[PDB]
Amino acid sequence: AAFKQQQTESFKKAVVARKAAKAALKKTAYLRARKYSR
Amino acid sequence: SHSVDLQWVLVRQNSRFLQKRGGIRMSNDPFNNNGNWTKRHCGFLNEKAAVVKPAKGGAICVTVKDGSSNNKPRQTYKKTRASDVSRAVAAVRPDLADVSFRRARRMACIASRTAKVAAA
Amino acid sequence: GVDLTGISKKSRVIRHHTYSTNPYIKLLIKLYKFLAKRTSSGFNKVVYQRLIKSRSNRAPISLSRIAVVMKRKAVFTAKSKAAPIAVVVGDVLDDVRMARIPAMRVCALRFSKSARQSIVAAGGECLTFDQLAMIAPTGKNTYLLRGRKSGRESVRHFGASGVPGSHSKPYATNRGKETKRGRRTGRSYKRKAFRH
Amino acid sequence: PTRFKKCRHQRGSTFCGYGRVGKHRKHESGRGNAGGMHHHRINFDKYHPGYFGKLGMDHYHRKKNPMWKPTINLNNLSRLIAAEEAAKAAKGGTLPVVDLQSSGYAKLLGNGHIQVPCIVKARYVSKLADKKIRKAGGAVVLQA
Amino acid sequence: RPSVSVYSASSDSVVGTCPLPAVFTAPIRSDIVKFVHTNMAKNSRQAYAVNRLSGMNHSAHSWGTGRAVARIPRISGGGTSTSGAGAFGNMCRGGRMFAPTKIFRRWHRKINLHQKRFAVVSALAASSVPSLVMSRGHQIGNVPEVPLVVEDSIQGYEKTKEAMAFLKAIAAIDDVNRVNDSREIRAGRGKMRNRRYVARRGPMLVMPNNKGTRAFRNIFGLDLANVSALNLLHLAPGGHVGRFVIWTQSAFEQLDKIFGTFTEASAVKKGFTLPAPMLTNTDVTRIMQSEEVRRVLKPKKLQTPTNGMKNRRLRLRLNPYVKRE
Amino acid sequence: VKMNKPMENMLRAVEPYIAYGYPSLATVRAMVYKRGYLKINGQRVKITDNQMIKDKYNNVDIV
Amino acid sequence: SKNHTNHNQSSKNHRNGIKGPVPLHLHNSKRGSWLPALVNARRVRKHNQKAALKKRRERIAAFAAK
Amino acid sequence: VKPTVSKAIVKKRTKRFTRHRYELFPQLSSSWRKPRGEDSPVRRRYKGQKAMPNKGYGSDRATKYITPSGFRNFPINNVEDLYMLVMQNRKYAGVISHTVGARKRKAIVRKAMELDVRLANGN
RNA sequence: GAUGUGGCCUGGAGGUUAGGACGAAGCUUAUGGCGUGAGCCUAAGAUGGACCGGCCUCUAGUGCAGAUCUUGGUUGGCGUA
RNA sequence: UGUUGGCGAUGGAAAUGGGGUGCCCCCACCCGUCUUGAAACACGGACCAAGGAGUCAAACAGACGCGCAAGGGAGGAGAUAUGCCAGUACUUCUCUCGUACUGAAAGGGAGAUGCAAUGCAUCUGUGGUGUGCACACGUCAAAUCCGUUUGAUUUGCCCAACACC
Ligand SMILES: [K+]
Ligand SMILES: [K+]
Ligand SMILES: [Mg+2]
Ligand SMILES: [Mg+2]
Ligand SMILES: [Mg+2]
Ligand SMILES: [Mg+2]
Ligand SMILES: [Mg+2]
Ligand SMILES: [Mg+2]
Ligand SMILES: [Mg+2]
Ligand SMILES: [Mg+2]
Ligand code: NA
Ligand code: NA
Ligand code: NA
Ligand code: NA
Ligand code: NA
Ligand code: NA
């Protein structure tokens, strides 16, 4: 079950990184939109 | 010397166990739990195999091919709840657990219905 | 309606599956398709592509050519590293013009009886592709080789023999019949042996 | 097999791959190699240069048995020696003997590098072959 | 090198043990078997043709145009119903067939000696895998072993009753019964042409010479073979490999001298050795699942509005600043 | 298109086939948000979030 | 019974396009040029080949020794 | 036994493709033959003529081959044929062959009733 | 005009699996079901009376609407000239 | 994704699909042919059954399948299992295509490197240069579950192949 455990641990590590990347991209888009409007 | 992959390549297209009627391909094999013509369920050529069969009365008999007495056709198959049947099969072949479970349930239901129509 | 004129002239003709009837060839293709799909190496992709080809496009190779190219690679290689494994998707034939060869490991689809005997006598090993998949699953430290195609009689016949600059053989069963007119200047003319 | 032919694929198509305009007729260009000088001249001249004419002297009663003369090369000489004698061979001592006319050859030619010294019995030999074998360490003996 | 038991003809007891010949480990090439069978089955054929004068024994001529009939040759004369009728044509009644058949059609075929030997070897190797025998169609459920080797004392039998008792003891009677029950009258025109009955194929019994066949000759559904001349048309009926063969011990020990091994040459077929295999181990799933391959396999990875304007969810997903405007 | 000389001399030669003019910010925004598709692996894919744009262009100036 | 036209010929020629010319560095033969310069060029090429063989031998010896 | 549920069957076209002008000649069969006349109106695709079969008339693969009862037909010839159907109960129904006699039909019908296997033409 | 098709169909051969006097082949159809189609399959016969189906290979005198096509039967004109 | 009615209580029922015949609104020139052009005042065309047209042999070539490979393979014939068996099993010698070409012919007849100018010496070897799979050694980007991938390029050897010698 070592392979399965490694797989599930890696997936649990990847989901949070995807969420963090989404969160960062949202802020970057907000800032750029504001400056373009100005 | 001659492996299961080679044998499957040799018999996939014509065999006495392959029934191609209409456009449907079934299997006549007595050691097949499904009827599908695939290498997983072709139990007559695999090294290890297990099949669930109906027995006298309400008994359920499981026939197991251990894989050590192949090349001795008279000693190839030695006989032996649905969870118990599945655990019995999974010792020989783990990938034959779900189908054997469902087959045991279906055999029990067939026996019950036969007893019903016998009483009627 | 969309204007897509001359869009079928971009289509390419590839093979994608084998016409061979050999079950062992089919087993090898089954192994190396999986390897090429699940591995990042280019060796596996090339080998898979060459297993699908036809017999005429897998030309045989020679023991003398193998020995020569291996030596030319070896002269510039560190003295502590090991020699590679020669791999050919095809047949390996013998050469009576070279008597003594080094000890090499060769992998091929087929060996002549004489080629096998020569290799083992010199002190090497003849491998199969299923053994190679277990020694070098990615193809590290290998020498991929191809056999020669030109010099075939069909290739030397391709073309028109009677146009200037052309040196292809004609289709004729009598060797003394087609000489003279169009081949000698004493007759009407002679076709020119060179053209820019 | 008749079931693999093109005529089985063409049942129902009237013209069988020959067209409605120019039909399929008996002999639309002549019979055989007719017209090699008039209306098939481009074909003849571009694919078969040299078909027409004469060249050379004649030879009224040719017999090939007196003209028999096959050839073999120095780098090919090892096909005529057995493996054990080839291993036992070495320049300076006792060498194997090869009989060309018994093996089916008449002349010895001198292409390549000789892979084993030996004594060769031949009906004919060339200058380079003789010189090369003498340098290698063997010899050539004329026979009849 | 594996070993094979030898069974007694009168009981369920093993008598000796013999090593397995190399021909049974030789490679199996069903494509070669099918090719050689297709071309070898053509050599026992006879010629047929029509007469060279048939359909053309009249003095017919065309009537031309001007008379309002089609331009086909017509039979001459008067006084019979055949006068003025069409002649000389595949389209006419009583006419000549299109392209009459000749007797110099190619009836027979040539096969390379090495390819014939290869096919025989492959069929022999396939006749030792018990699943291929079952797929071909034999009933071998209660058979002691495959290959089945039997003592050499059955060559002294003199009565078919003794022969049948031996067959029942060895348990070939199931396949013999299959053959017996299959017999019938053939469908189609063939039963008018000396081909009236059909039946299945049973077991084949191989003997070291041509002696001792008197008791077995009449048993329906059993075929007899000589080890010195083995026939591919019998080792692979229909072009399918996997016949059921019963070996006598002496023939079993002669197999190695007849066919040679992977290194030593045959003493009978001059300069013939068993073909080398293309794969050393033919199990590619084990290689695919091994640890050496799995260490290098690539790691696995983790895996509706459309308007964009006037859909607030999509608009705010694309442009998070629309709130502050 | 860019409205320079090499492109103006191309637009002048196919005039009976086209209509053109100078767009505004509203027009550009509407045509990107409503009817904008990308070329991803040679396929036509509709724009649905900013992650596709970032992955396609791989340039810190286009995210 | 004799007619001539150039109507469909441009379209036929452009179906598989007009192929461009071969690059000038390919098929750059010198046959038929000025013989006095041709001979001197041949001599220089021979010397160059000898030099290349010597250079490779030197490289091999250096790699082997060190 | 009840079949597995599926989507609704659509059947793009119900009418058959019959040959051109077979209604005027008794000897012409109604089966489809492709018209290859140079002036043929059916081949030239005029407005009021009949249609020719295409690949676009093909049926949805999710429901192809399914009969109105919800099963698919598998032909059987004797009693032992039902044992290979006993496991795929809700997918396939058996069709007794035309030439099986009454004596065997009785046994087949009884066994199928015991095993709970649907017969398309049972009794 | 070219090519492809675990694309359809007909007579025979090597294999394999099956059916039939409790009714084979053939024939009839407001007998439905399946397939884009060539076609396949079931039903009924208040038809028939002895043979024959599926699958894998092999083989050929292997698919008809028209040729002033060939042979046999029929037909309007017509109870007319 | 649930909710409310109608019909349906085992019938000669209800319902939904097929099939048949009539009707209404709309659409719609007669097939095969040759021809630049046919619905043609251009030819063939009363109905049905059965028959009816790219085939066999032989020489050569290209593509694809199979066996062996500097060799491949007979044919004719023989010998004994063999006396069901026109098949299958076995075979010395030879013959043929190929490994070498060129000249009208008499005839002649192809390795590399170094040193010299029918010369001499060595023999584990691409005759040289340009463009060139894979493999090996470095370096840099992008992405990343941080383990590696996907790319680029430098150098070594360059297999097949093409260009110039
Ligand atoms: K003209
Ligand atoms: K339909
Ligand atoms: Mg050559
Ligand atoms: Mg003269
Ligand atoms: Mg008898
Ligand atoms: Mg027409
Ligand atoms: Mg016939
Ligand atoms: Mg009707
Ligand atoms: Mg015919
Ligand atoms: Mg030559
Ligand atoms: Na023509
Ligand atoms: Na014309
Ligand atoms: Na006749
Ligand atoms: Na037209
Ligand atoms: Na007809
Ligand atoms: Na015509």
Ligand code: NA
């Ligand atoms: Na017309």
